[PDB]
């Protein structure tokens, strides 16, 4: 029952301005683009980058958004966080699944009737060994909007909630509030770029006007994404939060951040320090002139026997390990305690070289802890 609606061309910029909810840019994904006065709408909720924390906004008067999904590409290869809305319940299904590209929910204009409204959500084609089990109180109840902020710090997804009834504004024009209470769901996941989930509760079989004659869609979800700032917030009586003053919004707010206070007396103040950083990394050594005499041990006319093996000592010179290792002429190289990638930074007092003649079956016996001929 999975359907695909990924053929759409969203707005390139998709940028909106938020005053204080600091003063950053949040994506304005619309997912409802009517082609002129007559045409068919297109739904598109592409997977957006997580960017270590994401804030989502509903801005729906009919609860169009029913949660969010998160995790990897969700192709039955890794665990993916899930969140869905039941009739009166909260569903968390963080597990491994391989669902369709576009999540969809079931809605058939469930008005006042004998409870015969058919619905079917296609958001989980398969289900692996689940690791999530938590049910909370569902939240369903001149404007209506809501928001939530998700942040996974590998120990607990300290979610947020903004159930305050924001109104008398187009879309977050000036928010003089700060609230983020929500129930945490501690689980072990490696959540990659996430995606939204919407319910198409706009189809009507008895519309007065054709071509989406309903009042609104309205899948206007605002997502925006985060940065590791150090904004300074002061407590409030009754445990609330009064305002939020950042330490790097502008030079004025940095003065308030270093003074640990909101007001600033007229004068001059020192906040931080500046320092230009280096761009490259250089290491210099004296010129390489006196190479080690390695020709006597690699192109010798004759070699030694087993009982009369010769000993060669190499010292008081420089030995280039890159040319010897990158020769494309040998086939056996094994040792313990050192690695070829660590040979570039190590020095020893003396190097001893030995060579002899062995048989075909006398090559595996050169190893500590073994016996042989």
């Amino acid at each position, epitope marked *: *029952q*999975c*359907v*695909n*609606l*990924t*053929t759409r061309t969203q707005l390139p910029p998709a940028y909106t301005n938020s005053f204080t909810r600091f003063f950053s840019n949040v994506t304005w994904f619309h997912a409802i683009h009517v*082609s002129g006065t*007559n*045409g*068919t*709408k*297109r*739904f598109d909720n592409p997977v957006l980058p997580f960017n270590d924390g994401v804030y989502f906004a509903s801005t729906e008067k009919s609860n169009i958004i029913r949660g969010w999904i998160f995790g990897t590409t969700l192709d039955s290869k890794t665990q993916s966080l899930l969140i869905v809305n039941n009739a009166t319940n909260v569903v968390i299904k963080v597990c491994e699944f391989q669902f369709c590209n576009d999540p969809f929910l*079931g*809605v*058939y204009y469930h008005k006042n009737n004998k409870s015969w409204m*058919e619905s*079917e959500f*296609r958001v989980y084609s398969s289900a692996n060994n689940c690791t999530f089990e938590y049910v909370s109180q569902p939240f369903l109840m001149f404007k209506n909007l809501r928001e939530f902020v998700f942040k996974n710090i590998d120990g607990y997804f300290k979610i947020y909630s903004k159930h305050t009834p924001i109104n008398l504004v187009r879309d977050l024009p000036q928010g003089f509030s700060a609230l983020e209470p929500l129930v945490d769901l501690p689980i072990g996941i490696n959540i990659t770029r996430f995606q939204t989930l919407l319910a*198409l509760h706009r*189809s009507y079989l008895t519309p007065g006007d*054709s*071509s989406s004659g309903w009042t609104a869609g309205a899948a206007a979800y605002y997502v925006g994404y985060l940065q590791p700032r150090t904004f300074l917030l002061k407590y409030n009586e009754n445990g609330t939060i009064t305002d939020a003053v950042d330490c790097a919004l502008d030079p004025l707010s940095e003065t308030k951040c270093t003074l640990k206070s909101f007001t600033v007396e007229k004068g001059i103040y020192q906040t931080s320090n500046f320092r230009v950083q280096p761009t490259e990394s250089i290491v210099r050594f004296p010129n390489i002139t006196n190479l080690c005499p390695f020709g006597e041990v690699f192109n010798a006319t004759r070699f030694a026997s087993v009982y009369a093996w010769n000993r060669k000592r190499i010292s008081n010179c420089v030995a280039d390990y890159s040319v010897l290792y990158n020769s494309a002429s040998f086939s056996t190289f094994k040792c313990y305690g050192v690695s070829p990638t660590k040979l570039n930074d190590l020095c020893f007092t003396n190097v001893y070289a030995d060579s002899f003649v062995i048989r075909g079956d006398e090559v595996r016996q050169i190893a500590p802890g073994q016996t042989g001929k």
Partner: antibody
Amino acid sequence: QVQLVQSGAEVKKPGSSVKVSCKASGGTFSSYAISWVRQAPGQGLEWMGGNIPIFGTANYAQKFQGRVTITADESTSTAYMELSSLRSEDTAVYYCARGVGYRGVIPLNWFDPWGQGTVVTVSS
Amino acid sequence: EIVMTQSPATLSVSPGERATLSCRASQSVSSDLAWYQHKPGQAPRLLIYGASTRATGIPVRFSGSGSGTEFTLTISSLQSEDFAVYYCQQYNNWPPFTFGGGTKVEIKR
């Protein structure tokens, strides 16, 4: 008073691609959702896929991806379906159903109000 | 991919009698069923959509009944021209749609 006109019968050699187009006139072509149904001897009716009415996309079916491509034009009100990769069992008669009228939200797989029918045969 | 079947494969009903067609599905097909009539040399024509409501302009002889995965199609009036191939399509998903084997309407003799 809605009438659907499909393309005539054509013969396509193996290894070639054939496009079949069905045109709808006298009705809400923009609000219609075309589909493809092929019936062949020795087997039941098979539906390759269809176009979503509400959204609009080439919703294929199982064992049909990469073989049949369907595109719909709002201006021309005609849908053309292309077997590319053309074998013997693929020769059948295709039917078009644009007026999906028995389902819930986003009706699909109408199997109703079929077109005239275009005959496609594959031979050397 | 749901599986549906139509029985009997061949039915011999004399003219003026009642013809009964039984449909079944492996999933809940109480409100998801398609009935169409097809003839040789022409594309199939829809007869009943949803197994509960007859199409506009269709003959009143054709009718459908049943609940759940089982559906029954009954014809009050039997005609020689009305005798054709009928099939039931499974609509459990939106995807892929799986039509039934179909039935051949024979003349009793």
